[PDB]
Swiss-Prot record, chain A:
Assembly: The cytoplasmic dynein 2 complex consists of two catalytic heavy chains (HCs) and a number of non-catalytic subunits presented by intermediate chains (ICs), light intermediate chains (LICs) and light chains (LCs). Among them, a heavy chain (DYNC2H1), two intermediate chains (DYNC2I2 and DYNC2I1), a light intermediate chain (DYNC2LI1), and a light chain (DYNLT2B) are unique to the cytoplasmic dynein complex 2, but a subset of the light chains are also shared by dynein-1 and dynein-2 complexes.
Clinical disorder: Short-rib thoracic dysplasia 11 with or without polydactyly: A form of short-rib thoracic dysplasia, a group of autosomal recessive ciliopathies that are characterized by a constricted thoracic cage, short ribs, shortened tubular bones, and a 'trident' appearance of the acetabular roof. Polydactyly is variably present. Non-skeletal involvement can include cleft lip/palate as well as anomalies of major organs such as the brain, eye, heart, kidneys, liver, pancreas, intestines, and genitalia.
Subcellular location: Cytoplasm; Cytoplasm, Cytoskeleton, Cilium basal body; Cytoplasm, Cytoskeleton, Cilium axoneme; Cytoplasm, Cytoskeleton, Microtubule organizing center, Centrosome
Protein name, UniProt field: Cytoplasmic dynein 2 intermediate chain 2
Curated annotation (Swiss-Prot), chain B:
Protein's recorded name: Dynein light chain 1, cytoplasmic
Organism of derivation: Homo sapiens (Human)
Phosphoserine found at: 85
Main location, first listed in the record: cytoplasm
Gene behind this protein: DYNLL1
Pfam name, any one: Dynein_light
Subcellular location field: Cytoplasm, Cytoskeleton, Microtubule organizing center, Centrosome; Chromosome; Cytoplasm, Cytoskeleton; Nucleus
UniProt family annotation: Belongs to the dynein light chain family.
Modifications after synthesis and translation: Phosphorylation at Ser-85 promotes recruitment to DNA double-strand breaks (DSBs) by TP53BP1 and ability to inhibit MRE11. Phosphorylation at Ser-85 appears to control the dimer-monomer transition. According to PubMed:15193260, it is phosphorylated at Ser-85 by PAK1, however, according to PubMed:18650427, the DYNLL1 dimer is not accessible for PAK1 and the phosphorylation could not be demonstrated in vitro.
């Protein structure tokens, strides 16, 4: 005959943002040098 | 100077653009590095990244390309190699 009223509640939760990324690239530039440290005719005496 | 295509794995429209772009780059720059830089950047913009370009008078190469995105051609005595990979 005794009806008791009760109130229930569950705990809340917490989320968080995040990200993923594959490997990254970057540019590059090269110029080949053309040095010619060469004389005309060295008179050798080997 | 005169454009001569030796090999291509590329559509006809992109082939002509590659030559045209290199031709303009060769007109504007003397330094091969800067010519290559022009060609690469233009292709990334129009045909999506990532392109690579090598310009020079003396080299050999062995590279891997994505299908329909490789050309090798001469402008006079200067060879231009352009492709996508990555």
């Amino acid at each position: 005959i005794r009806w008791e009223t009760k109130s229930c509640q569950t705990a809340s939760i917490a989320t968080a943002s995040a990200s993923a990324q594959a490997r990254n690239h970057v540019d590059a530039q090269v110029q080949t040098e053309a040095p010619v440290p060469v004389s005309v005719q060295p008179p050798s005496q080997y | 100077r005169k454009a001569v295509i030796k090999n291509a794995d590329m559509s006809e429209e992109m082939q002509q653009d590659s030559v045209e772009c290199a031709t303009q780059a060769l007109e504007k720059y003397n330094i091969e590095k800067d010519i290559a830089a022009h060609i690469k950047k233009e292709f990334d913009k129009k045909y999506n990244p990532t392109w690579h370009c090598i310009v020079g008078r003396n080299f050999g190469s062995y590279v891997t390309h994505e299908t329909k995105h490789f050309i090798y051609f001469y402008l006079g005595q200067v060879a231009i190699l352009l492709f996508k990979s990555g």
